[PDB]
């Protein structure tokens, strides 16, 4: 029932989800002055060297690059993590038009659309039981701004127009997630909590200061998917991202400057 419409959208969620107005929600907004920088945090290690992605899906909300996480081959750690964690899926958040469609913001500012890649944490065995740990996942977000485009993002977008509408998938692999890192893995960090339903208190977010660009064309593809199924009416899948949250109790820290 959950998504982003006036009847049904994040305004709606906590009817269903009551975690909604919790203590831990995300995404926040991002205040980079009053960020504090902790000399103490590592550097981000990112290991996506073996990463083995397996299938693409539209699944109503967005869509998603699913990884074999059946073994230690592309990982998160380092940066606030004590533990190791495993890349079980990525899924992008965006807008209807340039401005808008990031989840977290800097200094209010919004950008065109938020990569997650989303890890949890060994320790727990699998997604399932991790989502049920305040420990239990990383999810490395990344800002994409327009401008030229990411040659590593094209494989992607190629391979949309395969899945248009909500329960269709395709094979897809080989596919290297190091193509849309930025060059510098500078970091803010705070805990958090899914963004979509079930909004579990779970992620220790990890957010990139640096955007990657993409071009105007590449994000156009991402607007012509499809929140409906193929038997049904057409609401193109744009505006897909939760607003900032309350930050509460918590205190945002920064690894750099
Ligand atoms: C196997 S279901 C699954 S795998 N990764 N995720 C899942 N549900 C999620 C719901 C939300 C997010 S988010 N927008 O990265 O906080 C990631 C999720
Ligand atoms: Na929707
Ligand atoms: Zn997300």
Excluded at 36 to 50: A, E, I, N, T
Excluded at 118 to 147: R, S
Excluded at 172 to 177: I, K, L, R, S, V
């Amino acid at each position: 029932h959950w998504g982003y419409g006036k009847h049904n959208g994040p305004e709606h969620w906590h009817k269903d989800f009551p975690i909604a107005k919790g203590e831990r929600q995300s995404p926040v907004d991002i205040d980079t002055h009053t960020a504090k920088y902790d000399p103490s945090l590592k550097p981000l290690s990112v290991s996506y060297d073996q990463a083995t992605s397996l299938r693409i899906l539209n699944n109503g909300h967005a869509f998603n690059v699913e990884f074999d996480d059946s073994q230690d081959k592309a990982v998160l750690k380092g940066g606030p993590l004590d533990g190791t964690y495993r890349l079980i899926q990525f899924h992008f958040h965006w807008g209807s038009l340039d401005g808008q469609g990031s989840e977290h913001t800097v200094d209010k500012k919004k950008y065109a659309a938020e990569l997650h890649l989303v890890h949890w944490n060994t320790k727990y065995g699998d997604f399932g039981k991790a989502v049920q740990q305040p420990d239990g996942l990383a999810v490395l977000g990344i800002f994409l701004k327009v401008g030229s485009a990411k040659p590593g993002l094209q494989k992607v977008v190629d391979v949309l127009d395969s899945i248009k509408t909500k329960g269709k998938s395709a094979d897809f692999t080989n596919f290297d997630p190091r193509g849309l890192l930025p060059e510098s893995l500078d970091y803010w960090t705070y805990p958090g909590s899914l963004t979509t339903p079930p909004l579990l208190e779970c992620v220790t977010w990890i957010v990139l200061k640096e955007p990657i660009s993409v071009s105007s064309e590449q994000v156009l593809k991402f607007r012509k998917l499809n929140f409906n199924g193929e038997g049904e009416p057409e609401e193109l899948m744009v505006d897909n991202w939760r607003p900032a949250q309350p930050l509460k109790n918590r205190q945002i820290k920064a690894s750099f400057k």
